[PDB]
Design a protein around this ligand. Structure first.
Ligand SMILES: Cc1c(CN2CCC(Nc3ncnc4sc(CC(F)(F)F)cc34)CC2)ccc2c1cc(C#N)n2CCN1CCN(C(=O)CF)CC1
Length: 468
């Protein structure tokens, strides 16, 4: 190709030219993933990587993009034995997916930063031979679409990516790395990570993308950051309009995190006549409830972060309680460290910041501060209960005295006569605990005075106090 089902369109000199290109591709039953990713990376390269690049908007000539397009396809088609990896039923094999994975893997530069920005698109792969972890997986999918394998698709969790294929559409295969120095099982199924109930594989409730959702992923993969303090407004606008395009077409229906991304963008710059950010946050959560058994963490974190920024403490605490209620039915494993850092920061930094803020107006007698709402205390309890339950059954522990220090300080923010309003009932503001650490603690939580040493011993599985 390109056989040129789409070849007005060019060149592209505005944000809206990129949108119409995507609108044309999303009407073909196979939207050209390689073409669209190349355009995105090109535009992002001259708006975020190099800017002197250009001032207004980078003009993408078809001659340029087609030259990069043909070098990617000529590579892929030059290195893999498509007929020898045949069409045993019209679907791909593990040997063919592994071979294509092998081709991308052996093309990357031996030395670079696996976490740099702006190395996620096929533009990065074709010009600098560098990709991040999830970019390698997407490059495999796009390479397979280039070969004609309409059964190879992108699988996504909240921190990892791989490929689904084979008999519609069960077969999974690792195609990229995850984390630093965790041995690579490329070609293997993900069913060991599903069986161990690690958050990295969402207990099997991971996203299985069609070609439209794969287009949505590369849109979310746009990084508008030019450095550490400034974003490219132009790139923020394009991601916003592209997500709103996928939105209206119905292609974010099964993409909870994409609705969070657009809601975050709407908060920065509202689009006239579009739903308010809160609407979209609830749409992402409802998407996770409907299609993935409500086992995703980020739909609620998206909402919790919005409520935290706007100082809706009760709604923020309830959204974090929901994150804990989801996390509680997983086992904490190595590879799950990214979600550990999120829970660690919320419990030991964000929530203490919010409660201390609410503690100050307690002496400034203005009641109505969230520290007098027993609902807020119930959500904080459900939050720690879900993390405790998360820890049980795990190969490695979660909680420690650093966790214990801020739990005690947080409980202490609530007056005793507010804490005592929460009804903790054992099955079999009303709350039910599921972790054994919190159940044994319930009387200590609603005491007139908070016994700091006792609760710390309860939470950290410590057995003994200092001898002296
Ligand atoms: C929205 C958000 C983010 C943003 N992230 C951006 C990247 C998103 N991923 C994805 N998004 C779309 N598709 C994919 S596919 C994939 C797997 C891969 F393909 F890549 F393998 C990942 C992924 C997930 C959400 C990070 C931490 C956050 C929150 C929200 C909270 C909360 N609460 N947190 C916790 C840390 N703090 C943040 C700032 N914060 C506040 O502003 C105060 F409210 C306090 C909390």
């Amino acid at each position: 190709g390109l056989k040129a089902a789409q070849k007005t369109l060019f060149p592209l000199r505005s944000i809206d030219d990129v949108v119409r290109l995507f609108a044309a591709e999303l009407g073909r039953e196979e939207p050209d993933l390689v073409l669209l990713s190349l355009v995105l990376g090109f535009v992002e390269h001259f708006l975020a990587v190099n800017r002197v690049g250009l001032t207004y908007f980078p003009v993408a000539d078809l001659s340029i993009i087609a030259a990069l397009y043909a070098r990617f396809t000529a590579q892929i088609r030059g290195a893999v034995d498509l007929s020898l990896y045949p069409r045993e039923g019209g679907v791909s094999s593990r040997e063919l997916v592994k071979k294509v994975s092998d081709v991308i893997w052996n093309s990357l530069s031996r030395s670079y930063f696996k976490d740099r920005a702006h190395i996620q698109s096929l533009f990065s792969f074709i010009t600098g031979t560098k990709l991040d972890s999830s970019g390698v997986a997407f490059a495999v999918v796009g390479a397979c679409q280039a070969l004609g394998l309409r059964d190879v698709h992108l699988a996504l969790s909240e921190d990892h990516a791989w490929v689904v294929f084979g008999p519609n559409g069960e077969q999974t295969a690792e195609v990229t790395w995850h984390g630093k120095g965790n041995e690579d099982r490329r070609g293997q199924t993900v069913n060991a990570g599903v069986a161990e109930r690690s958050w990295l594989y969402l207990k099997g409730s991971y996203m299985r993308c069609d070609r439209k959702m794969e287009v949505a992923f590369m849109v979310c993969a746009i990084n508008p950051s030019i450095d550490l303090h400034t974003d490219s407004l132009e790139l923020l606008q394009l991601q916003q309009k592209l997500l709103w395009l996928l939105y209206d077409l119905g292609h974010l229906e099964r993409y909870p995190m994409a609705l969070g991304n657009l809601a975050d963008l709407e908060e920065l710059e509202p689009t006239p006549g579009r739903p308010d950010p809160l609407t979209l946050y609830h749409k992402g959560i409802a998407s996770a409830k409907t299609y993935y058994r409500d086992e995703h963490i980020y739909p609620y974190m998206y909402l919790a972060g919005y409520h935290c920024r706007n100082r809706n403490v009760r709604e923020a605490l309830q959204a974090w309680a929901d994150t804990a209620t989801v996390i509680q039915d997983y086992n904490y494993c190595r590879e799950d460290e990214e979600i550990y850092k999120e829970f660690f920061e919320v419990a030991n930094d964000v929530i203490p910041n919010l409660l201390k803020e609410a503690a100050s107006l307690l002496e400034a007698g203005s009641q109505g501060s969230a520290l007098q709402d027993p609902e807020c205390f119930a959500h904080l309890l459900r939050f720690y209960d879900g993390i405790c339950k998360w820890e049980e059954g795990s190969p490695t522990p979660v909680l420690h005295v650093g966790w214990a220090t801020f739990l005690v300080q947080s409980l202490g923010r609530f007056e005793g006569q507010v804490r005592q309003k929460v009804r903790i009932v054992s099955v079999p503001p009303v709350l039910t605990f599921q972790s054994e650490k919190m159940k044994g603690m319930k009387e200590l939580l609603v005491a007139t005075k908070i016994n700091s040493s006792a609760i710390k011993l309860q939470l950290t599985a410590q057995s003994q106090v200092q001898m002296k």
